[PDB]
Design an enzyme around this catalytic site. Structure first.
Site, short mmCIF file in Angstrom:
data_model
loop_
_atom_site.label_atom_id
_atom_site.label_comp_id
_atom_site.label_asym_id
_atom_site.label_seq_id
_atom_site.Cartn_x
_atom_site.Cartn_y
_atom_site.Cartn_z
N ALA A 70 0.75 -1.16 0.04
CA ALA A 70 0.00 0.08 -0.06
C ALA A 70 0.95 1.31 -0.02
O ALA A 70 0.52 2.31 0.47
CB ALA A 70 -1.15 0.14 1.10
N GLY A 71 2.10 1.15 -0.72
CA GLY A 71 3.07 2.28 -0.72
C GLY A 71 2.46 3.04 -2.17
O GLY A 71 1.54 2.70 -2.73
N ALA A 121 3.39 2.72 -5.09
CA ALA A 121 2.95 1.88 -6.33
C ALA A 121 1.47 1.24 -6.11
O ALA A 121 0.96 0.93 -7.04
CB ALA A 121 4.08 0.86 -6.68
N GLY A 122 1.54 0.73 -4.96
CA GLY A 122 0.40 -0.28 -4.66
C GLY A 122 -0.90 0.63 -4.57
O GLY A 122 -2.06 0.19 -4.89
N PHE A 138 17.42 19.36 -9.94
CA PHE A 138 17.85 17.80 -9.43
C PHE A 138 19.13 17.39 -9.98
O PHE A 138 19.44 17.84 -11.20
CB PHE A 138 16.74 16.94 -9.32
CG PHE A 138 16.33 16.43 -7.81
CD1 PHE A 138 15.56 17.43 -6.88
CD2 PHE A 138 16.56 15.06 -7.38
CE1 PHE A 138 15.30 17.23 -5.65
CE2 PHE A 138 16.20 14.89 -6.13
CZ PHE A 138 15.50 15.90 -5.30
N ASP A 189 10.08 -8.06 0.95
CA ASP A 189 9.16 -9.20 1.10
C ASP A 189 8.67 -9.79 0.03
O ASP A 189 8.61 -11.07 -0.26
CB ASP A 189 8.14 -8.87 2.08
CG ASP A 189 8.72 -8.57 3.51
OD1 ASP A 189 9.83 -8.74 3.85
OD2 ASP A 189 8.03 -8.36 4.61
N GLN A 211 22.21 1.81 -4.81
CA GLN A 211 22.40 3.23 -4.72
C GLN A 211 22.86 3.69 -3.30
O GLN A 211 21.86 3.42 -2.43
CB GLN A 211 21.36 3.98 -5.37
CG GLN A 211 21.44 5.53 -5.02
CD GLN A 211 20.47 6.44 -5.97
OE1 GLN A 211 19.52 7.00 -5.29
NE2 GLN A 211 20.68 6.22 -7.38
N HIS A 224 23.00 7.17 -1.37
CA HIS A 224 22.78 8.61 -1.64
C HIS A 224 24.03 9.48 -1.06
O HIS A 224 24.35 9.20 0.18
CB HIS A 224 21.40 9.16 -0.92
CG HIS A 224 20.87 10.16 -1.20
ND1 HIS A 224 21.38 11.53 -1.05
CD2 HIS A 224 19.83 10.30 -2.23
CE1 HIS A 224 20.57 12.47 -1.30
NE2 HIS A 224 19.50 11.59 -2.16
N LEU A 269 18.23 10.79 5.79
CA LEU A 269 18.52 11.21 4.43
C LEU A 269 18.31 12.81 4.49
O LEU A 269 17.30 13.35 5.02
CB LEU A 269 17.30 10.69 3.44
CG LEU A 269 17.35 11.39 1.85
CD1 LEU A 269 18.99 11.08 1.26
CD2 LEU A 269 16.26 10.81 1.08
N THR A 295 17.73 15.97 1.68
CA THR A 295 17.07 15.69 0.18
C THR A 295 18.47 16.39 -0.67
O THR A 295 19.22 16.88 -0.28
CB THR A 295 16.03 16.53 0.04
OG1 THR A 295 15.59 16.47 -1.37
CG2 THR A 295 15.98 18.00 0.41
N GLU A 296 18.40 15.79 -1.97
CA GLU A 296 19.34 16.16 -3.00
C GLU A 296 18.86 17.77 -3.32
O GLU A 296 19.85 18.26 -3.83
CB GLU A 296 19.18 15.32 -4.14
CG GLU A 296 20.08 15.80 -5.40
CD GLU A 296 20.47 14.64 -6.30
OE1 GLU A 296 19.33 14.18 -6.92
OE2 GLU A 296 21.61 14.19 -6.54
N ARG A 330 24.15 10.60 -8.44
CA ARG A 330 24.47 10.23 -7.07
C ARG A 330 25.36 9.35 -7.03
O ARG A 330 26.20 9.07 -5.90
CB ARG A 330 23.18 9.63 -6.38
CG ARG A 330 22.10 10.75 -6.41
CD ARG A 330 20.65 9.86 -5.78
NE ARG A 330 19.69 10.85 -5.69
CZ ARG A 330 18.39 10.55 -5.23
NH1 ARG A 330 18.00 9.34 -4.99
NH2 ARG A 330 17.49 11.67 -5.04
N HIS A 360 20.29 3.87 -0.21
CA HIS A 360 18.98 4.64 -0.20
C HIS A 360 17.95 3.85 -0.93
O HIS A 360 16.76 3.46 -0.57
CB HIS A 360 19.30 5.85 -0.97
CG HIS A 360 18.20 6.72 -1.19
ND1 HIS A 360 17.61 6.62 -2.43
CD2 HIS A 360 17.69 7.66 -0.42
CE1 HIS A 360 16.72 7.52 -2.18
NE2 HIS A 360 16.62 8.13 -1.24
N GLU A 411 9.74 0.11 -6.10
CA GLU A 411 10.98 -0.22 -5.93
C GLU A 411 11.25 -1.80 -5.97
O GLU A 411 12.14 -2.29 -6.38
CB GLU A 411 11.44 0.23 -4.35
CG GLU A 411 12.99 0.12 -4.30
CD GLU A 411 13.44 0.50 -3.01
OE1 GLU A 411 12.60 1.42 -2.00
OE2 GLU A 411 14.73 0.57 -2.58
N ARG A 434 19.76 5.53 -10.57
CA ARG A 434 18.59 6.13 -10.46
C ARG A 434 18.85 7.51 -10.42
O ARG A 434 19.50 7.94 -9.52
CB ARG A 434 17.68 5.65 -9.49
CG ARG A 434 16.17 6.01 -9.37
CD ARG A 434 15.65 5.95 -7.94
NE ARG A 434 15.46 7.34 -7.41
CZ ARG A 434 15.30 7.64 -6.18
NH1 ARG A 434 15.27 6.64 -5.09
NH2 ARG A 434 15.16 8.91 -5.72
#
Ligand SMILES: *Cc1cc2c(cc1C)nc1c(=O)[nH]c(=O)nc-1n2C[C@H](O)[C@H](O)[C@H](O)COP(=O)(O)OP(=O)(O)OC[C@H]1O[C@@H](n2cnc3c(N)ncnc32)[C@H](O)[C@@H]1O
Ligand code: SF4
Ligand code: F3S
Ligand code: FES
Ligand SMILES: [K+]
Lengths: 259, 604
Positions: B22-23, B25-26, B126, B229, B248, B250, B260, B262-263, B294, B361, B395, B406
């Site tokens: 449920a991120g 993408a989900g 970026f 998972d 990767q 970061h 983190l 941010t870039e 990066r 990262h 991911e 990336r």
């Protein structure tokens, strides 16, 4: 060698919850409370259960009650002293296990306010972003950062007493966020629905929600603004407006919704 | 429903599609499937808003053109160069050509983007982004929402899922996939952490939208929930995983917290200095000093500390100086960084430098996928062969849009684009109304037996100790600069840690919120993916993108422009070997709207 008393409940034994004392060397532990809990679980008692993801305060999953005041364990600092550091679950919540609360009602109440942008006209083909000025975007500054930690919720004496009728500070602030979003076109519908004695006017201005907010937001100020706006804008026809929207949700699935 | 397999209460659900995760993408995939009229369920270990997507800070890349003139084709060229010519140019075109639409759709659902003076969406600079196919200057394509662009996206995608009324199974830990004898996924087998019951979700098409496996290293920016998972599930199904060696780091992560920065901090004027006080990034990647890729920045930082020009009492880190920038810009554009620094580092951004160090990262590897998000099971004759009933997004998936490295603000774009694509692809396969799937007769038998064997585990080693051992080996044997000798040592060590999982023991034997058991099941996934990473890296005798071998310091396009596929021999991690095969990279773009970006030097 700090002492950490932690609330413990087994959902299977169903024995009366109790506080167990652990001793941890702060030299080999991280500054934050969550580090102490992880160290206890890793070394002494792996049965200990608690929610934790982000470790940086952003997910809003480590909300607990530390030495009386709600907070996020990952942002809370260990304060060494002779007095044991008491860690318990969120106040007046059903404990699924040890420090893991049951926040299902909080999730349902949020779904009720329908926190998604509503517009009367569907984006015409060939249209770009809906216009919002910098000033309008500034209005939504302190309200869109809420991480749903649910501390303000479980710190309100009015949510302790009427949890299933009062929406609570966090949900109410989110409702104001969508009532204040210039792009939303259902301002009157949202105000009419929220204009209920139990949903909104159970806030008595205790201000515990603003004091315990881990993200430094002010849910109390937002509820005061929302009450002033409703009072000035009320019309006799609001009840009919709520009914018409309820008819529009007739074919929705089984879950909390505008009605 | 109600059944009883090996003494466990098994419920049966029969949907048209199931989405594990449920991120970003989900949530997108689920909303799309429901919008297509398909009955769908969305399983997640955490409330959807607590996923790692919420911790994202930078933004999403789109050729909106709100700040400067832009073309999606230019964004596409940048991604090919950033991938170091390991990413599929077919998938890159599909993602870049849809980036404008996807971002505007997110705004249409209420995403509180930051605004310009004309009421349009603000876009920030970026690293790795240019204009005019590299002949122009820095490109401002990263549509950001302050320092909270993840919180915004995840909350908005949850709102969209609520609007579409998506069936969510929250706090359900997925255990395995219900594979058929023929070789088709027929659903997933999950457990409820709130009731303790096993559920056998049976769907025609399954979408694996889990995250990465960044918690397999000692210091990471990933969440404790990032255990990969869905990759373990695929590996235990006998299917391949891809490009697991490309991890990767970061460039800027708070020292030693591992948080983190941010870039965008550098993309708004931030400068990295050393013990000599030099903006050393001009020596490496001179044209784009701090806004280089990066992978280049991280390698430069590591060499600098190694050369002795490191900052701190232990001369172990590097300093990021944002103090020179205006305080209003810091408060307006980087509102979240400042607080996190003040807490986890005790730094006042406006007056002091922030201690930073390269930290793991993201993971460019994952389930092999095509441009339609259909998981692949390559064969010697059919490198594009697809698992019949499986799809992947996020991911977790490896469509190879990101290749060997990336570009910042492209992952959140891959979440929305490929989650949407996955929903479209299922719509074509499964009709809105279809006869229910026939779950195979022995569906879950093995999974239930293993779950029970792990539940009643009374061996000498503890899950935490074993995890620390794995995290240490990965951090020390697969660092920014990898050498073949260490990679071999580590490959032996991870194999030992694999056979040590047979001695793990848990003390809690309950089924309701048994974090001890859940964490041991997660360690199995972490071990298998971490093993495949070390094995794949040692096998790759070149230096591409994030994979930087000191022994072999040069790209080998002739013999190493290939995707690396890893396979777990047996379903049990303590009874398996990591076999490695390879599949070719797709170099031709899907349409003629974009041209093939020929392989070239990546100087930055
Ligand atoms: C870690 C990170 C990543 C990141 C970023 C900053 C950080 C600290 N900033 C970004 C940025 O500025 N711009 C950008 O383009 N990307 C950025 N990223 C990358 C991105 O946030 C991550 O790659 C992200 O993880 C991708 O999202 P995704 O939806 O694929 O994964 P997730 O957010 O981690 O959530 C996955 C969901 O799956 C559930 N899950 C996991 N295991 C299970 C099982 N066993 N069963 C069921 N569900 C499962 C998780 O609970 C989660 O909900
Ligand atoms: S208002 Fe504050 S305490 Fe309440 S949910 Fe939002 S961030 Fe948490
Ligand atoms: S403490 Fe409660 S009563 Fe109102 S001012 Fe805060 S929500
Ligand atoms: S672990 Fe995410 S808020 Fe603390
Ligand atoms: K409004």
């Amino acid at each position: 060698m700090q002492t950490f008393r932690v609330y413990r409940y087994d959902p299977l034994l169903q024995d009366k919850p109790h506080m167990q004392e652990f001793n941890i060397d702060l030299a080999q532990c991280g500054p934050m409370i969550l580090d102490a809990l992880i160290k206890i679980k890793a070394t002494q008692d792996s049965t200990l259960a608690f929610r934790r993801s982000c470790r940086e305060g952003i997910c809003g999953s480590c909300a607990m009650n530390i030495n009386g005041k709600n907070g996020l364990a990952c942002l809370q600092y260990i304060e060494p002293g002779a007095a044991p550091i008491d860690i318990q679950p969120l106040p007046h919540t059903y404990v699924l296990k040890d420090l893991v609360p049951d926040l299902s009602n909080f999730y349902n109440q949020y779904k009720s306010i329908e926190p998604f942008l509503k517009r009367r006209r569907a984006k015409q083909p060939g249209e770009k972003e809906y216009y919002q000025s910098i000033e309008d975007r500034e209005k939504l500054d302190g309200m869109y950062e809420c991480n749903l930690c649910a501390c303000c919720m479980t710190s309100c004496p009015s949510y302790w007493w009427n949890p299933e009728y009062y929406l609570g500070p966090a949900v109410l602030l989110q409702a104001y966020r969508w009532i204040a979003d210039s792009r939303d076109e259902f301002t009157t519908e949202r105000m009419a629905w929220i204009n209920d004695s139990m949903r909104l006017y159970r806030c008595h201005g205790i201000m515990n929600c603003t004091s315990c907010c881990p993200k430094g937001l002010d849910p109390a100020k937002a509820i005061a603004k929302m009450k002033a706006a409703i009072a000035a804008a009320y019309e006799p026809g609001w009840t009919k407006i709520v009914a018409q929207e309820s008819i529009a949700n007739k074919k929705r699935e089984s879950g909390m919704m505008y009605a | 429903a109600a059944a009883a397999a090996a003494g466990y209460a098994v419920h049966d659900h029969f949907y048209d599609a199931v989405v594990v995760g449920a991120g970003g993408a989900g949530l997108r995939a689920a909303s799309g499937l429901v919008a297509h009229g398909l009955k769908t369920a969305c399983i997640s270990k955490v409330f959807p808003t607590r996923s790692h997507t919420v911790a994202a800070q930078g933004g999403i890349n789109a050729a909106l053109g709100n700040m400067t003139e832009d073309d999606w084709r230019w964004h596409a060229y940048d991604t090919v160069k950033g991938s170091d010519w390991l990413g599929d140019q077919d998938a890159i075109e599909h993602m870049c050509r849809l980036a404008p639409q996807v971002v505007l759709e997110l705004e249409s659902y209420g995403l509180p983007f930051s605004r310009t003076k004309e009421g349009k969406i603000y876009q920030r600079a970026f690293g790795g982004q240019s204009l005019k196919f590299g002949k122009g200057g820095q490109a401002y394509r990263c549509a950001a929402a302050a320092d909270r662009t993840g919180h915004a996206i995840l909350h908005t995608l949850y709102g969209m899922s609520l609007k579409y009324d998506c069936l969510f199974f929250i706090e359900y830990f997925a255990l395995d996939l219900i594979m058929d004898q023929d070789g088709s996924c027929k659903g997933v087998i999950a457990m409820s952490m709130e009731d303790g019951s096993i559920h056998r979700f049976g769907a025609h098409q399954t979408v694996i939208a889990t995250g990465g496996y960044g918690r397999a290293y000692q210091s990471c920016t990933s969440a404790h929930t990032c255990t990969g998972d869905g990759g373990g599930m695929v590996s235990r199904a006998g299917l391949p995983l891809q490009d697991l060696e490309f991890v990767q780091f970061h460039p800027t992560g708070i020292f030693p917290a591992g948080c983190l920065m941010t870039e965008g901090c550098r993309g708004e004027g931030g400068i990295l200095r050393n013990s000599e006080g030099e903006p050393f990034m001009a020596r490496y990647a001179p044209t784009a000093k701090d806004l280089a890729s990066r992978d280049v920045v991280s390698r430069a930082m590591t060499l600098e500390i190694r050369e002795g020009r490191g900052v701190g009492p232990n001369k172990d880190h590097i300093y990021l100086h944002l103090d020179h920038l205006p305080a209003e810009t810091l408060r307006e554009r980087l509102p979240g960084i400042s607080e996190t620094a003040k807490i986890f580092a005790g730094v006042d951004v406006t007056k002091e430098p922030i201690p930073v160090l390269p930290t793991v990262h993201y993971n460019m590897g994952g389930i092999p996928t095509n441009w339609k998000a259909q998981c692949l099971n390559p064969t010697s004759s059919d490198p594009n062969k697809i698992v019949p009933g499986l799809l992947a997004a996020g991911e977790a998936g490896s469509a190879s849009v990101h290749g060997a490295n990336r570009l910042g603000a492209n992952s959140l774009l891959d979440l929305v684009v490929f989650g949407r694509t996955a929903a479209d692809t299922v719509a074509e396969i499964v009709k809105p109304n279809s006869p229910p799937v026939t779950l195979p007769k022995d569906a879950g038998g093995g999974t239930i037996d293993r779950f029970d064997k792990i539940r009643h585990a009374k061996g000498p080693v503890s899950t935490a100790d074993l995890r620390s051992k794995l995290q240490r080996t990965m951090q020390t044997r697969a660092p920014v600069y990898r050498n073949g000798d260490d990679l071999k040592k580590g490959c032996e060590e991870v194999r030992e840690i694999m056979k040590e999982y047979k001695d793990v023991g848990i003390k809690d034997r309950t089924l309701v919120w048994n974090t001890d058991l859940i964490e041991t099941l997660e360690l199995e996934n972490l071990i298998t993916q971490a093993a495949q990473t070390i094995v794949s890296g040692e096998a790759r005798k070149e230096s591409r993108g994030a994979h930087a071998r000191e022994d072999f310091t040069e790209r080998d396009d002739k013999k190493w422009m290939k995707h690396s596929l890893s396979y777990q021999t047996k379903p049990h991690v303590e009874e398996s070997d990591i076999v490695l095969k390879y599949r070719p990279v797709v170099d031709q773009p899907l349409d003629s709207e974009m041209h093939h970006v020929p392989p070239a030097k990546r100087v930055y």
